[PDB]
């Protein structure tokens, strides 16, 4: 269940980007926190578009994950506010914003360690979500924000945080889809009503190889009859220019879904690169 944030305490103020069938933008939250003190909150406005109510309880269920589990690499929401005949999330505001964004402005002052620790970060956030049994669904840079840029004066790492998952692919239309290629697994592309445990395992391995091309998206070139073809074919993504994690997106982008390792051999296997 939901806090009720009241549309008084609530600034809209910049657009941040777009979602699939959502709008986000930067907010201003007037509340009461510790010890009383009044503060106004920067906050993440999410707002599901006009035309595609039809997909608020997946909207909704998908954040509600979020909010029944706490984890430091996991997007805090604060609630939802009735700002208006609008359904919109409330949410923490990511200093930073998204990976991918970041990967590509700093390709150059980004090294092979800086990418290492985010890819631990992740495994284990994505660790976490197995162990309950749950399903994200929509890994990738996109959705990965960061927290803390690195410090090189104290050596000091970054830190990231994984967003909601946002419409689930088990009801989102097939050409959307498919433009998702190579995110969504191939078998969610065949089927995705039947989404298991092992689809954040191949997406995980797509996302790793966002951050190992500096913000390039895999298979960008191709359209989506391409994107189909690609599978049909059962091809794996070239290695990225930082091969050191070649071999570990090619493990997780198995096109057997049982095949694919579990997080904590992930885990385990980034560490070993050491
Ligand atoms: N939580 C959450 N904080 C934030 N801060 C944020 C947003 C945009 C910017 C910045 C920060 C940094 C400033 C700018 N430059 C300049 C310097 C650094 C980079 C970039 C702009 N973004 N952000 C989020 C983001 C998303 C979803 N959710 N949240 C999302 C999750 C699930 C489904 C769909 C979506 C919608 C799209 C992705």
Redesign the pocket.
């Known amino acids: 269940v939901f806090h009720k944030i009241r549309n008084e305490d609530l600034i809209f103020n910049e657009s941040?980007?777009?979602?699939?069938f959502?709008?986000?933008f930067?907010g201003v939250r007037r509340e009461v926190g510790d010890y009383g003190q009044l503060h106004e909150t920067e906050v993440?406005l999410?707002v599901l578009d006009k035309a595609h109510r039809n997909y608020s309880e997946s909207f909704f269920e998908?954040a509600s994950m979020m909010s029944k589990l706490s984890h430091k690499h996991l997007?805090l929401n604060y609630g939802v506010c009735f700002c208006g005949d609008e359904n919109i999330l409330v949410?923490?505001?990511?200093?930073?914003?998204?990976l991918d964004?970041?990967l590509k402005?700093n390709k150059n002052c980004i090294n092979i360690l800086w990418k290492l620790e985010v890819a631990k970060q992740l495994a284990a956030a994505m660790h976490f979500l197995e162990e309950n049994t749950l399903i994200h669904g929509?890994v990738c840079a996109?959705?990965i924000?960061?927290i803390r840029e690195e410090d090189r004066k104290t050596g000091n790492p970054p830190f990231i945080?994984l967003?909601?998952?946002?419409?689930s692919i088990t009801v989102l239309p097939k050409d959307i889809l498919q433009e998702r290629i190579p995110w969504v697994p191939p078998e969610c592309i065949e089927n995705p009503k039947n989404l298991n445990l092992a689809t954040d395992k191949w997406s995980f391995g797509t996302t790793l190889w966002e951050i190992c091309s500096g913000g390039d998206k895999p298979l960008s070139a191709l359209d989506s009859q391409r994107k189909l073809q690609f599978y049909e074919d059962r091809h794996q993504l070239p290695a990225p220019k930082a091969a050191e994690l070649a071999n570990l997106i090619n493990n997780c982008m198995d096109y057997e879904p049982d095949h694919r390792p579990s997080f904590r051999a992930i885990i385990r296997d980034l560490n070993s690169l050491f």
């Open positions: 941040l980007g777009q979602g699939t959502t709008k986000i930067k993440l999410k998908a997007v949410q923490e505001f990511v200093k930073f914003g998204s964004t970041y402005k929509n996109k959705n924000l960061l945080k967003s909601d998952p946002g419409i």
